[PDB]
Ligand binder design. Structure first.
Ligand SMILES: O=c1cc[nH]c(=O)[nH]1
Ligand SMILES: O=c1cc[nH]c(=O)[nH]1
Ligand SMILES: O=c1cc[nH]c(=O)[nH]1
Ligand SMILES: O=c1cc[nH]c(=O)[nH]1
Ligand code: NA
Ligand code: NA
Ligand code: NA
Lengths: 251, 252, 251, 250, 251, 251
């Protein structure tokens, strides 16, 4: 039985019950190669799927693409194939001045500025990670030597107006999002990304274990542009951390 | 001058194109571009494969959107930044009316907004409606191809599974909001389900951009939940011919 | 057999399945006399009902009164008597600089600033015209020689605060509607009226065909006042257009 | 100087600050003639306007048409012309078994199943009448000898699905309103009508005094009423609102 | 045979079908001792319950604590034991400039800025008092010599941000409540308190009679924190009125 | 200055930056006595305030009363006097069959079925605890010997309809909450209580650290009635745990 979007079978996964789920298809092989015996499984649309072994145990790496809609498909189809634990790694924009490029964020809860979360739970439901996964991510991120922040993530269905960017084609932001960045800042929100609300809400309400770790690639309050070196390091550290968090989740 | 954040192309790269064809699947991009003159690969980052081509002597961009409103909104915004004003979406859809067949075409006249990204451009009250010229061109292109064509309302969902009231899933549960929702839409005359039209049409209708949506029916939900891969290739060839002809009509 | 409000029977309509639905009871006779053998049927409250013949086929002309509630009654009761196609004609106020007095607007979709549309479909449902009816109206309007605008209409339950008028008794507009005209303007919305969201949503969700065409008789952005001869020419043009749209809908 | 829809001026109203606002333009003359010196002022669309004298003081009678949108126009324009008090009269259909044809309902509050109300205040604002107007209406209703019910009215933007009628073209009722009648019944709601939520919210949030009184002519729960009872109820309703107005004036 | 939170039995109430429900448990004894044969029944949490006699009939006096949640528990459990009439007395802040400290406000309707009302009826439902109770409270207040105002009350789940207080730890008010006080003021709203929306909605939708009378302890056009010097006298007046209101409801 | 409701000053607190906040006023002394030099500070309405010392540092114990509104006042006024960390302890009813009487729950996130949370942040914002507090609570709970569950809690503005109880005066539950217990159960929610949504949302959005730990007194899915010895043992255990959680937070 092949799942419709991902194009893999349960046999393909080789008993894996844990998935690492990056956003970018290009990141899948890189993560897989940090582990043992990486094996390319399939590539369809934004979904690149690999299998590898961590401490003897089969693990899946599967990209989600951008946004909760495409993430929700990947998570659902992997769950059909037996995956029960989902470790999200992705890039993020910080919105607090104390948070620097190269820092790591582990989401304790997400502002649900998406639509897909609502297809699993009403708005009142918290977009919260599994406590064990969040604990493992904090441990792995801190043990890596990175500066780590635990806190609330604003998770948006857009990269532009939902993150109150005005340097756009229309230069307009709809009423709902006018003044919204200052509002999140004052509420102590750490960062913007585009998948965590969907991921955390669907998993918390569906008996699946999930968490999110993110490397800070930009800070919206900072005028300085990060150099190539810092970005490469950040990207390398992010995937190292997610693999080590996965190691901590294995039993 | 500037390279857009995700698409990784410049305005110079597009060679003066003001119209884009925006399929969902990156693999479908080259297939669209080769139906036109002088296709050139521009960039491929994440779910975004960008080609340029020439249609009747005018530069046309072809760019994948990936799945869903959020991914789609990035592509449209960045293409608009580089001078694109008209967007023709082509994709696959599931029919919820029993009379619509696999292989039929649907041109969306309005979208039920079961997405979140549309709200990042306009309040829920705003209609998720296409540019009338694009919708007219798509209908005509679809008819002239020999296809059975349906004009009507499309339900546009941020999920493939529960928001389209699919029950063959890991939990087998559908949240309260969406229980009975397919039969609701059906009784209301809604033709089909897909995942990008509400975001695309709302975003464009509220931003001074022209947009439309044509889709190939790959499944009828009165039979089953998961689409057969057979007849999927056949449906996809017709769909892309229709959209290139629709683009031709738009360029005058 | 006799509908509750309209005071007509199925027999009274002589097999008509198309209705032209103006707002003002006073306009019904004027529209009906553009066609052949106009016959007065009933008059109760804001509902004046005529019958006429167009290219040999029976046509109904029925006023709706102001607002979606009154309109919803008329459309429902006509539908009970076999009417399937509804052509809304009126005069409207433009909010775009480029739209002049004497231009025609054909609605491609309505902003649902009403309440009655929610009695037929949740807010997510598009207040969209039937495509054939929209097509017939565009053709009739363009063939008349008028400049025709295809676009979005804001459809409000009030004439005053919902259209952000401050020239009022209180001079206040509720928070929801503060800054709303400029918001609609920036979004490309063409005009305000008060019935289309109800008509379009109810029909699009009930297996009925509907559309709206309106003549522009004032512009909220222009200080200059239109002269009498233009206003009456626009009103005359509006009703000729809708009758020709009806002709295009007969088969 | 002359309001946009009503086609009357402030001079036309002769200093009137109170208005009686029936729904049906045909009822306007019938209310006006209960007072002194009734004079037709204007008729445009569903707005028929008369002026009259009650105890030496000028009073305006103006039809609203059906629904909150048309009502909101009438009330606003009358307000521009100095009207500060609005008395709504009608006949209605009850949803409670204990409420009989011939009884009067005085609305103490409205379920806001409309849209125009939200153009004046957010949903959390109560669609509530002015206490003096409601008090005067109760007294006048009791003084007429009828059984009077004080309570909540469900105010709907539609006559059909918003009142959970299934005897319709589609025979469907949107999810929001499925089971709603039983819901309102169990919560003690007295009746359905179509204008009060808009009228009451608009006036309560704009410094205007308003209230609603209505004769019961049909009951959704009771299988039935005599023609003589119906015209008597209609006659009583407008007698009551005029006497309610007299109380308001002094 | 005791209710879960209140710790009273039906026998404890000695036939009472009317309750006076102040907020503060300290006002319970005071109110009871304005009547005959006051008897302490129970005290648990914020719920102090007394019995007394008014013109030979049993009345219950029971504190609600602060807010709709704790109020809802008290009303429900008293209803279970046979109470059908609930007279709320409390403190309030005026938002209109003409309303002075020491004045009495009888609520004709409540702005539902609470959450507990939604546990009884959808937002569309009016938070309206029983007419007889409101009439009795007006009469009691006017007959006592006090200055009385009848009108709309804004009923908030918070004392601070929901009543637009800025003299707080953060100094910040969430978007929803920014500018809200002036909005209520412009709309003719008289006062702020914290229980009436819950109480009135619950009772109006549950076949129970309820009303609210409140003594003005602060005018918000002046300041945010109530002066201590005037509380005692204002509270003395309030409880005098509610007891007289109760006398008028006895049948 | 002395805060309005609590009746205490900053000097009263003796430098305390951490508060333990039970619901019941009667629990305040019982918690304080587990620490050194407990001293009664004030008692007004439902707010009983004590000060104590834990490993040489000042700690405050303050009752909240029932529900978010009362809680919001206590948290805000303590925050004005320098309190930055809030540890909630209480009772709860489990809705999962696997959760036994005598077990403890540490809330990782709350379903916002309250009103007061909205006065601090829109519904999209997660009702989430501070991660260090939840970590400290889990550790303290485990080291006490009890079985601990980490998970989502449904936080309701009512005890009755919002927790889908039908054994009530009216015997009915508003549409919104019909079928809601089963919904939460299928979504993996552990329990119902009445304060966590407000507490966690206000603190997470206001730069305050907060968490919630609770003893399971009763299971909605079990028929077996828990022994008196069990219920008292769990009450005692809950407060020992929160004091230990406090110790972990201080150093
Ligand atoms: O600013 C950013 C950076 C990465 N991802 C986002 O969603 N936003
Ligand atoms: O059923 C379907 C088929 C294609 N695309 C969808 O979104 N749904
Ligand atoms: O301002 C005030 C005074 C008393 N009670 C309130 O809720 N607010
Ligand atoms: O079931 C319960 C038990 C304690 N507290 C609650 O709120 N609910
Ligand atoms: Na995508
Ligand atoms: Na009308
Ligand atoms: Na309380």
């Amino acid at each position: 039985k092949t799942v419709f979007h991902l194009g893999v079978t349960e046999a393909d996964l080789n008993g894996a019950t844990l998935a690492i789920i990056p956003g970018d298809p290009a990141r899948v092989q890189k993560i897989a190669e940090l582990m043992d015996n990486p094996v390319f499984l399939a590539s369809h649309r934004e979904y690149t799927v690999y299998r590898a072994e961590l401490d003897g145990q089969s693990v899946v790496v599967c990209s989600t693409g951008i946004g909760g809609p495409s993430t929700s498909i990947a998570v659902e189809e992997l769950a059909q194939l037996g995956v029960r634990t989902f470790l999200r790694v992705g890039t993020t924009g910080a919105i607090q001045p104390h948070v620097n490029v190269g820092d790591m964020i582990v989401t304790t809860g997400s502002v649900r500025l998406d639509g897909a979360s609502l297809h699993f739970a009403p708005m009142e439901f918290p977009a919260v990670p599994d406590f064990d996964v969040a604990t493992a991510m904090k441990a792995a991120a801190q043990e890596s030597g990175a500066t780590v922040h635990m806190g609330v993530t604003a998770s948006s269905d857009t990269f532009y107006p939902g993150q109150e960017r005005y340097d756009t084609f229309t230069g307009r932001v709809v009423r709902r999002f006018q003044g919204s960045m200052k509002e999140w800042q004052d509420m102590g929100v750490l960062n913007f990304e585009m998948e965590s609300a969907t991921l955390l809400t669907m998993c918390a309400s569906s008996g699946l274990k999930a968490g999110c770790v993110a490397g800070v690639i930009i800070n919206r309050t900072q005028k300085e542009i990060p150099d190539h070196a810092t970005l490469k390091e950040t990207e390398a550290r992010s995937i190292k951390v997610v693999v080590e968090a996965a190691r901590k989740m294995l039993k």
